[PDB]
Antibody, heavy 217, light 205 residues
Framework: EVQLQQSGPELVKPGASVKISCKAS????????INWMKQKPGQGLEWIGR????????KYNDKFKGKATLTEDTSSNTAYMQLNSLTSEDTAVYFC?????????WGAGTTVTVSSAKTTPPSVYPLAPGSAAQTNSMVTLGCLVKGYFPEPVTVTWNSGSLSSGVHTFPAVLQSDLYTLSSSVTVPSSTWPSETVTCNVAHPASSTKVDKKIVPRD | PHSASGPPDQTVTISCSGS????????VNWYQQFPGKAPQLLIY???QRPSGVPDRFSASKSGTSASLTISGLQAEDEADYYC???????????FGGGTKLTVLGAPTVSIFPPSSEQLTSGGASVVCFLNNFYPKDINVKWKIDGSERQNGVLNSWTDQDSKDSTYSMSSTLTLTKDEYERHNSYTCEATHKTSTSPIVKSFNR
């Protein structure tokens, strides 16, 4: 099947450079005109650059002309976006698209954060109930992911097997550190019967930690 | 509009206007960006449906005025709809604002004391669940020994859940270990239209 997968994002200092790649599969890559579309935090979609399988190679948003270079390697089925002289305005999720008119296929997107702040791994704290009032029926467990930078972190419960009854709250920024929480509601007979764990990944610092939820004494 | 709150089964319509005619060449498309997903094209060439898109969607318009209609809204329809032209139609390609959707809203209903592990670091965070509620509007207050606290509270809402169409919020109150230990009662108080009196959860050290 058709898929686009981006990689190369992360933290970059203003003026620094980053190179994003998109890996295409499930279609004849050489046939299609490919683009990058970006979305700044809490804002709308914005076209960045296009490359068509012609004799030449490209179109650019005016603001990125001279700083960004869009290229492709048809032999590796890969699209590239070289970003130099990055500004704070460049912070956003970058999506690779394979339009036909018309962006019919999109990548998952990759977050690029242009900031002076340092990479800081998250402290992950298991949130076990501190009251016996909430027993039986449904028990709610928590995971607190505190003091990290930059976004994003990934939170799963039991490596993904626990999908339903999960609320992962959007992170709050405070003094260049993000904190988020995630709650999970399971039947009380599942916990502490069987293990419940939260899995936190912070690829910006290569942090990958699992915190088993153990009941309090 | 910049909004759109429709009940399941009812019709919805979105309008899009362009400053210049774009009926030529292509090229007017409609995209849908479901929460936590990449945009997905539903209609191209004004009224042609993309593969997989339900019959419920219909696109029309001409010149500078465009409309996207959904004869019957289903839970899976929620998200952000965008209007867009062709990058090679008028260059450069541009998108409409936000599909009419923008909001608030971020607690927890179920309260948690700081873990022993955190207290060791010299910090103390109290966390407060407010799950599966509607409407999104809700007010959460923190009281430490009866006194309301505004400083050091982080709130954060989830997008509307496609399974039950409810929202959930998380509210965290972060104090130093020293200040946490100089007080006894910690309360999370939620004001929501569903209850005449605020819902209260608390614990005492």
């Amino acid at each position: 099947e058709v898929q686009l997968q981006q990689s190369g994002p992360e933290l970059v200092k203003p003026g620094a450079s980053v190179k994003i790649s998109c890996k295409a599969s499930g279609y004849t890559f050489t046939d299609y005109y490919i683009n990058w579309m970006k979305q700044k935090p809490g804002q709308g979609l914005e076209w960045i650059g296009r490359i068509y399988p012609g004799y030449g190679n490209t179109k650019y948003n005016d603001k990125f002309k001279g700083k960004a270079t869009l290229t492709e390697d048809t032999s590796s089925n890969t699209a590239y976006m070289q970003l130099n002289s990055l500004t704070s305005e460049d912070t956003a999720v970058y999506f690779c698209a394979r339009s036909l008119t018309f962006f019919d296929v999109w990548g998952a997107g990759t977050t690029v954060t242009v900031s002076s702040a340092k990479t800081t791994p998250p402290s992950v704290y298991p949130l076990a109930p501190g009251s016996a009032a909430q027993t039986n029926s449904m028990v709610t467990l928590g995971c607190l992911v505190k003091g990290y930078f930059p976004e994003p972190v990934t939170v799963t419960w039991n490596s993904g097997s626990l999908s339903s009854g999960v609320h992962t709250f959007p992170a709050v920024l405070q003094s260049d550190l993000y904190t988020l929480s995630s709650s999970v509601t399971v039947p009380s007979s599942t916990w502490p019967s069987e293990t419940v764990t939260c899995n936190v990944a912070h690829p910006a610092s290569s942090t990958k930690v699992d915190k088993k939820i153990v009941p309090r004494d | 509009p910049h909004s759109a709150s429709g009940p399941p089964d009812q019709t919805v319509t979105i309008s899009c206007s362009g400053s210049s005619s774009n009926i030529e060449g292509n090229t007017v498309n409609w995209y849908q960006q479901f929460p936590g997903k990449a945009p997905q094209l539903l209609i191209y060439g004004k009224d042609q449906r993309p593969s997989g898109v339900p019959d419920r969607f219909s696109a029309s318009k001409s010149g500078t005025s465009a409309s996207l209609t959904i004869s019957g809204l289903q839970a899976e329809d929620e998200a952000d709809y965008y209007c867009a032209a062709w990058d090679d139609s008028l260059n450069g390609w541009v998108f409409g604002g936000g599909t009419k959707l923008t909001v608030l809203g971020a607690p927890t209903v179920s309260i948690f004391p700081p873990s022993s592990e955190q207290l060791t670091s010299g910090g103390a965070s109290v966390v407060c669940f407010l799950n599966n509620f509607y409407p999104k509007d809700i007010n959460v207050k923190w009281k430490i020994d009866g006194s309301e606290r505004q400083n050091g509270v982080l709130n954060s809402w989830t997008d509307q859940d496609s399974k039950d169409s409810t929202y959930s919020m998380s509210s965290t109150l972060t104090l130093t270990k020293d200040e946490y230990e100089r007080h006894n009662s910690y309360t999370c108080e939620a004001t929501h239209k569903t209850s005449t009196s605020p819902i209260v959860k608390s614990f005492n050290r």
